[PDB]
Amino acid sequence: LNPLSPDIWMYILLAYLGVSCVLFVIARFALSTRIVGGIWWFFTLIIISSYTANLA
Amino acid sequence: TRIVGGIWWFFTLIIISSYTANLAAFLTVERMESPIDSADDLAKQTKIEYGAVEDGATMTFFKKSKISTYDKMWAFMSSRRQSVLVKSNEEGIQRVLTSDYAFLMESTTIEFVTQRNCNLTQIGGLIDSKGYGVGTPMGSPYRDKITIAILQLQEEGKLHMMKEKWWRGNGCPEEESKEASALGVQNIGGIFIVLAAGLVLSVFVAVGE
Amino acid sequence: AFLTVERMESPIDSADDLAKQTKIEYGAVEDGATMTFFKKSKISTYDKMWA
Amino acid sequence: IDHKADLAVAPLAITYVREKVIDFSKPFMTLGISILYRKPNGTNPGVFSF
Numbered sequence: 001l002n003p004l005s006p007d008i009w010m011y012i013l014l015a016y017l018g019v020s021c022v023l024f025v026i027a028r029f030a031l032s033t034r035i036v037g038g039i040w041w042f043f044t045l046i047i048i049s050s051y052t053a054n055l056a
Numbered sequence: 057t058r059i060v061g062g063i064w065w066f067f068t069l070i071i072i073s074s075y076t077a078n079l080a081a082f083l084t085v086e087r088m089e090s091p092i093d094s095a096d097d098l099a100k101q102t103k104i105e106y107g108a109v110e111d112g113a114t115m116t117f118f119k120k121s122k123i124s125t126y127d128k129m130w131a132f133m134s135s136r137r138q139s140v141l142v143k144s145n146e147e148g149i150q151r152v153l154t155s156d157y158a159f160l161m162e163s164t165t166i167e168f169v170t171q172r173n174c175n176l177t178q179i180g181g182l183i184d185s186k187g188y189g190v191g192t193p194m195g196s197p198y199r200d201k202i203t204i205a206i207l208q209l210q211e212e213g214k215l216h217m218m219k220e221k222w223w224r225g226n227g228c229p230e231e232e233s234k235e236a237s238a239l240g241v242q243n244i245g246g247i248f249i250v251l252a253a254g255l256v257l258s259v260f261v262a263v264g265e
Numbered sequence: 266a267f268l269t270v271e272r273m274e275s276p277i278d279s280a281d282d283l284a285k286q287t288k289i290e291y292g293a294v295e296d297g298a299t300m301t302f303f304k305k306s307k308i309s310t311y312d313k314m315w316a
Numbered sequence: 317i318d319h320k321a322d323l324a325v326a327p328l329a330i331t332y333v334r335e336k337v338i339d340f341s342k343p344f345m346t347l348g349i350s351i352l353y354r355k356p357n358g359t360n361p362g363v364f365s366f
């Protein structure tokens with residue numbers, strides 16, 4: 001957990017919870033689903049790449 | 057649908073690999089170079105100019121110094137005497153401020169200056185052995201009386217307060233001491249902001265229809 | 266690794282980059298007032314170039 | 317030189333010749349030559365640093 005600061009891990013956890021909650025809300029309430037999946041995939045891409053680069 | 061999915065996956069792998077490789081290279085070249093020059097070891101650097109006051113105590117010390125770290129510094133200063141050496145302390149401070157140039161000066165003056173303004177730093181310190189004190193040309197006893205006054209003055213707490221209030225001056229903004237290698241908030245927060253923007257746009261376009 | 270290797274070296278070699286590196290060669294006239302300055306006036310990087 | 321100043325207080329590094337001719341008192345303050353540099357500013361690339 002050194003490469004990512006603790007506040008960043010706070011933000012990652014809350015972003016995961018928020019995306020899960022908004023996905024559940026959308027399912028309760030497919031272009032929007034595609035956009036949500038794409039933006040979440042981009043976020044995961046950036047976070048994993050930054051973590052890998054810093055730890056390298 | 058098989059070919060397009062496979063080629064999209066391959067493209068994704070190539071893109072993530074390239075992005076991670078470039079970011080790793082950038083962070084590695086950032087971390088490999090020290091934020092400051094080699095502390096008290098400006099030898100093997102020859103890019104940051106360095107010098108002391110002309111014909112000063114530091115200049116005289118570096119003249120009569122045979123350490124491998126300091127004789128090279130003396131040779132560099134002598135070979136560029138008209139450039140690195142300056143006449144006065146304030147001239148040296150101005151030269152350091154205006155361009156990439158390190159200055160060598162007495163520690164008390166350095167801390168006094170860096171407390172007067174916080175646009176300057178003291179890298180190493182105490183690389184020479186010297187001190188300040190009163191004197192008497194003759195072997196008088198009253199100088200020894202002064203010395204016992206010195207010792208009884210340090211035996212109780214009065215020197216530190218007067219010394220600090222004479223050097224405190226104005227306040228100095230807080231600065232890090234032992235910050236780790238983790239990413240800063242400003243370093244990453246862009247992806248958080250863009251994710252929030254994408255999510256709110258997706259919500260808006262979902263509720264629009 | 267490839268990007269780190271090709272980015273670690275300074276894109277423009279300077280008065281210090283040449284001394285630490287060995288891939289790029291450097292030279293001058295044989296004792297044509299250039300290495301005569303290199304042998305004396307022992308500067309760390311300049312000593313490395315002279316060697 | 318002519319001993320027209322009984323007490324001598326000033327910023328005076330205790331050197332070999334000064335100790336040779338003046339038996340200086342115990343050092344008021346211990347110090348040495350230090351190096352000076354400009355504070356390295358933080359080149360913030362903005363929030364969109366990725």
Ligand SMILES: *[C@@H]1O[C@H](CO)[C@@H](O)[C@H](O)[C@H]1NC(C)=O
Nearest residue numbers: 155156354355356357358359
């Ligand atoms: C800020 O740091 C950079 C990087 O070395 C350098 O240009 C200089 O030290 C500073 N630039 C300023 C103060 O304009």
